[model samples]
Target: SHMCDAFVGTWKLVSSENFDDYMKEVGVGFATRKVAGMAKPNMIISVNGDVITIKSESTFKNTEISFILGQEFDEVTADDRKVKSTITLDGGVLVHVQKWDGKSTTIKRKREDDKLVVECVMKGVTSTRVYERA
Candidate 1:
């Protein structure tokens, strides 16, 4: 882990915008979104050499993704979408991409002044989620 060292730790969601629409675009069912939208999840990040684990957790459910930097791997998303994912670390920004069928989603995460800012994009829609260290 290089710039990733700055990202290791637990982060609690502080605020979010356009997250509902973002979930719709990514194909999360309304029922699931209903449940998911209720909780502000904690983002847990762990790093070990070239490997990293990204965990999203709330009281209702938990989802996790683990991968090596810049490596591609197949993932069954939290909502059951099978996607090809790649997470690359560059210039202190962590860009995570997931592709399935002909659609793709990108989530860019960065540390801005001690806060974790995440930009999740799919199609032309964008959602921003901010988190503080927990």
Candidate 2:
């Protein structure tokens, strides 16, 4: 039911595990990492036809990206990295892969127990962020 239904909803972060490590792996600055760890961004996902847009907003910074599943595109990450990104719906999970500077990262989002779980992995490090419907 991945692409058959829309994933339009608002979610609030509940907890993040190993988020700092993931940020560090992405080359985030010390000061920015500290602030990011404490910030809880509201995430909004909207789907229209084959287009999907994800927006994360907070007091510190806001980031948004739009793409069609299975289509590769260019994305400038909030961390200021230029990456080639492609998103695909695998089973019931939304999988995103980004490549930049000879490195790659994979992120997956899925719903479980009425909550949204986001997993980000780069190299061998992984971060899990759980969010509840808001």
Candidate 3:
């Protein structure tokens, strides 16, 4: 928690692999996927006590979330889904899980050298998004 300085910085997206398919599995429509496919979001991360915050800024929309590790919190996702989300720090990776309507997804966030790597999984699809310090 206190060692979150690695992620406590403004980061801009460098690349996202298989993001369209990942969004597709989340029930996002083709129209939305096409728009999001070309989108690049800047992520700002911060920490306060045991709470971690993440802000996603994009041309399409901006979303922010703050939560304590291992605690469930109500969250409205960027794609308009209301889900219960929890975050846990496992080793050096932050494991984020979201659940809604019987479906669940996991997003793992870790710092790889100087890059912030976010890997998300839903069903059998996996996508990785890389970010660099801005």
Candidate 4:
């Protein structure tokens, strides 16, 4: 329905789960991690045709990236975290083909139970973060 498409709009973070692990995976420090863990990370997802632009804002930092499904593109992260990705749908799951530096980084996203779930895999560690609607 249209509401599903409505999920395509920009969104602000009201709450998160397992966000601390996410920051830690990004090499964040303990103190900064604490602050980041407790922070409400604002997110914006823009869909223009088959391409998508995603933005995540927080007191700690702001990161933005854009990509088209099924086509890999070099994407630089907030604060210069360089990456590459191609997003596609697999059985309704949004798959992210992320390449950081010269290695392979993959992630996926899906909407479940009124929340957006972000599942990330990199460097042999898998982490998932859940965002509740505000």
Q: Write the per-residue lDDT of candidate 4 for residues 18-107, one digit (tens) a residue.
A: 556655666657887776666677777777776677788888678777766678787765435577668887877878876665766567
Model 1, residue 14: C-alpha shift (Å): 0.7
lDDT of 2 by residue, 1-134 (tens): 24725456999999999999999998889988898788899999988778899999887679999998899999987777899999998988999999998999999999888889999998889999999989
Candidate 3 structure, TM-score to reference: 0.96
Decreasing TM-score order of the candidates: 3, 1, 2, 4
Name the candidate that leads on lDDT: 3
Count of residue pairs whose backbone atoms collide, per candidate: 0, 0, 0, 0
The candidate 2 region of ten consecutive residues with least summed lDDT is 1-10
Q: Which ranking of candidates, highest lDDT first?
A: 3, 1, 2, 4
Q: Which candidate is the best by TM-score?
A: 3
Candidate 3 overall lDDT versus native:
0.92
- lDDT for model 2, please: 0.88
Better of 2 and 4 by lDDT: 2
Error of 2 at 55 (Å): 0.4
State the TM-score for model 4.
Answer: 0.72
Better by lDDT, candidate 3 or 1? 3
Write model 3 residue lDDT over 1-134, tens digit each, in one string: 47687889999999999999999999888888888778899999999888889999998779999998899999998888999999988998999999999999999999999999999899999999999999
Error of 1 at 75 (Å): 1.4
Q: RMSD of model 2, in Å?
A: 1.6
